[PDB]
Structure formats: structure tokens, C-alpha cells
Design a protein around this motif. Structure first.
Motif, short mmCIF file in Angstrom:
data_model
loop_
_atom_site.label_atom_id
_atom_site.label_comp_id
_atom_site.label_asym_id
_atom_site.label_seq_id
_atom_site.Cartn_x
_atom_site.Cartn_y
_atom_site.Cartn_z
N UNK A 1 0.03 -5.54 57.97
CA UNK A 1 1.35 -6.10 57.70
C UNK A 1 1.10 -7.34 56.89
N UNK A 2 1.63 -7.34 55.68
CA UNK A 2 1.48 -8.47 54.79
C UNK A 2 0.04 -8.87 54.56
N UNK A 3 -0.86 -7.88 54.48
CA UNK A 3 -2.25 -8.15 54.21
C UNK A 3 -3.06 -8.54 55.43
N UNK A 4 -2.45 -8.51 56.61
CA UNK A 4 -3.10 -8.93 57.83
C UNK A 4 -3.20 -7.75 58.80
N UNK A 5 -4.32 -7.66 59.53
CA UNK A 5 -4.47 -6.65 60.58
C UNK A 5 -3.73 -7.21 61.79
N UNK B 1 -3.03 -2.00 51.53
CA UNK B 1 -3.91 -0.86 51.85
C UNK B 1 -4.70 -0.33 50.64
N UNK B 2 -4.00 -0.07 49.54
CA UNK B 2 -4.62 0.44 48.33
C UNK B 2 -5.61 -0.59 47.78
N UNK B 3 -5.18 -1.84 47.78
CA UNK B 3 -5.99 -2.93 47.24
C UNK B 3 -7.26 -3.06 48.06
N UNK B 4 -7.16 -2.94 49.39
CA UNK B 4 -8.34 -2.99 50.26
C UNK B 4 -9.36 -1.90 49.86
N UNK B 5 -8.86 -0.67 49.68
CA UNK B 5 -9.73 0.44 49.37
C UNK B 5 -10.34 0.28 48.01
N UNK C 1 -2.63 2.02 58.21
CA UNK C 1 -1.22 2.25 58.09
C UNK C 1 -0.50 0.92 57.92
N UNK C 2 0.68 1.00 57.36
CA UNK C 2 1.47 -0.21 57.13
C UNK C 2 2.53 0.08 56.10
N UNK D 1 -20.73 12.92 50.12
CA UNK D 1 -20.97 11.48 50.25
C UNK D 1 -20.85 11.01 51.70
N UNK D 2 -21.65 10.01 52.09
CA UNK D 2 -21.54 9.56 53.50
C UNK D 2 -20.22 8.83 53.82
N UNK D 3 -19.53 8.33 52.80
CA UNK D 3 -18.25 7.64 52.99
C UNK D 3 -17.16 8.23 52.10
N UNK D 4 -16.03 8.59 52.72
CA UNK D 4 -14.93 9.18 52.02
C UNK D 4 -13.74 8.22 52.10
N UNK D 5 -13.19 7.86 50.95
CA UNK D 5 -12.00 6.99 50.87
C UNK D 5 -10.88 7.90 50.40
N UNK D 6 -9.92 8.14 51.29
CA UNK D 6 -8.89 9.13 51.10
C UNK D 6 -7.49 8.53 51.13
N UNK D 7 -6.76 8.72 50.05
CA UNK D 7 -5.36 8.22 49.98
C UNK D 7 -4.48 9.43 50.18
N UNK D 8 -3.82 9.48 51.34
CA UNK D 8 -3.02 10.59 51.81
C UNK D 8 -1.53 10.40 51.52
#
Ligand SMILES: Nc1ncnc2c1ncn2[C@@H]1O[C@H](COP(=O)(O)OP(=O)(O)O)[C@@H](O)[C@H]1O
Length: 233
Positions: free
Chosen positions: A204-208, A53-57, A46-47, A167-174
Motif C-alpha cells: 500500500x503506497x509502496x509500503x508492506x 508492485x511493477x516497479x519493485x519487480x 498484491x495491492x 530459471x531458478x527465479x520466475x518473475x510473473x505479472x498475472x
């Protein structure tokens, strides 16, 4: 040529992000992100819009390449895997998943399922309602990049595909169907998603800046509290 040649046969779904950084030109959008996701967990990111967030995924699917840090799948650096192998372990649910200028059926089947298996998934995804109305039903062509479908329709096609791929990993954009029975990385926009998540990562600003469960984070009266109060957008 690709960076990796390894083909992992069986993946449990542990995802490790470590010291991950990325920039668009001089705009640093991710700075030293580190998150360890154990197999089967649901982790909500979240953020505020623009937090990365999108870029990370995207970086996880190798749609972009990190400037620093690593992404490990069951402890193996993703860059050491073939791209076909890597992606075989991932399901992406969003409005922006690449769709082929092909039928509804072939878009769901690509990557062997019966027509009734596909119809059943479309219904569970609540996608058959618009797909029925298509001229050729499941055999209707959906255009370049699925352009005959709007965003919400495209997302529902990605859900039908995720229901079948397992798939064992699900990347979900809600949903609770898959999310529960695999590792889920969710960009969260629903209060119910964060309230039930195994772990929330606050960006926040690319930082956790914060990480934990809803109850403890909400009590802290920090960024998460503010994000939850404003409806995660
Ligand atoms: N193709 C691009 N070129 C330059 N900047 C971009 C591009 N795509 C995204 N950005 C920027 O990267 C930052 C992070 O965006 P994004 O990862 O979409 O964040 P979120 O998903 O948290 O809204 C934003 O400031 C956005 O404008």
C-alpha cells in the motif's frame, strides 16, 4: 563498465529484498520494502494499482536502480553480479518483456533448442494457436519489440521461453508447471494464486503493510481482506 563482475555459477533461488526504496522524482513509490523469499517458494504481491508492485519487480531485473536497500540472490547483492549473469538466473513473464525484431523461434531460443522443443513449449504456453496462423509459423518475424503481437500474445511467448529456460527465479505479472518448481515472485490478480501462495505480501503506497498466508490474512479483516473481496483489481 558495470557495477558488478561476479558470475554466480549455480543459483538455488533465495531472494532477499531489504530496506528497498525508490522514487520517481519527488514521488516515493517504494518505502523500506523488506521481504525474504526462500528458494522454491511462491510469493504473491498484491495491492491497489500504483502500490509499487511493477516497479519493485523491475528493480529486481535492474531495469531501475533502488535509491536505498538491497536485493540479494543467494545472499549476493545483485549489483555485484554481471547483468548477463543476473538475468541468466531470472525468467520474466509479462506483456512487456523485451522482444527482438526477429522470428518467434529466435526470440524463444536466444540466451541450444530444437525446433520441435520450441513447438512443444509454444503449445504448453497455448501460443502455437496464433503462431501456427503466422505466415511462416515459428519462423515468422514478430517486429520491433514484438509489435506484430498483442499483449496477451507477447506474454504467451514469454511463457514458452520460461518453460525452456528453467530459471531458478520466475518473475510473473498475472504455469503450475513452472510456478511450483522454481522460486516465483508473482504480481497476483487471480484469487486462486493468492489462495495457494506460500506467502502473500500486501503493498500500500509502496509500503508492506501485511504479510502471511491467505487464511490468516483473510481473517484479519484488513487490507488483504478488502483486496480479496474486490477481486485483486
Ligand atoms: N516512468 C514513470 N515516471 C513517473 N512515475 C511513474 C513511472 N512509472 C510508474 N510511475 C508511478 O509509480 C507508482 C507505482 O506504479 P507501479 O509500480 O506500476 O504500481 P503497481 O504495479 O502496484 O500498479 C504509480 O503511482 C505510477 O504512476
Amino acid at each position: 563498465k558495470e557495477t558488478g563482475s561476479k558470475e554466480l555459477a549455480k543459483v538455488d533461488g533465495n531472494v532477499t529484498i531489504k530496506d528497498l526504496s525508490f522514487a520517481f522524482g519527488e514521488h516515493k513509490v517504494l518505502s523500506g520494502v523488506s521481504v525474504d523469499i526462500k528458494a522454491g517458494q511462491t510469493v504473491a504481491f498484491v495491492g491497489k494499482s500504483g502500490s509499487g508492485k511493477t516497479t519493485l519487480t523491475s528493480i529486481i531485473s535492474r531495469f531501475y536502480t533502488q535509491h536505498e536497500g538491497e536485493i540479494l540472490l543467494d545472499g549476493v547483492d545483485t549489483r555485484e553480479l554481471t547483468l548477463e549473469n543476473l538475468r541468466s538466473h531470472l525468467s520474466i513473464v509479462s506483456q512487456n518483456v523485451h522482444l527482438f525484431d526477429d522470428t518467434v523461434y529466435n526470440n524463444i531460443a536466444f540466451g541450444e533448442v530444437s525446433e520441435e522443443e520450441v513447438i512443444d513449449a509454444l503449445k504448453r504456453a497455448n501460443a502455437y494457436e496464433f503462431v501456427q496462423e503466422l505466415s511462416d509459423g515459428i519462423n515468422t518475424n514478430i517486429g520491433n519489440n514484438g509489435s506484430k503481437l498483442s499483449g496477451g500474445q507477447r506474454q504467451r511467448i514469454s511463457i514458452a521461453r520460461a518453460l525452456l529456460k528453467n530459471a531458478p527465479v520466475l518473475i510473473f505479472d498475472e504455469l503450475e508447471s513452472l510456478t511450483k518448481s522454481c522460486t516465483t515472485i508473482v504480481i497476483a490478480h487471480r484469487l486462486s494464486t493468492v489462495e495457494n501462495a506460500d506467502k502473500i505480501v500486501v503493498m500500500d503506497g509502496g509500503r508492506v503493510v501485511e504479510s502471511g498466508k491467505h487464511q490468516e490474512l483473510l481473517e484479519q479483516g484488513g487490507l488483504y481482506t478488502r483486496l480479496y473481496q474486490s477481486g485483486l483489481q
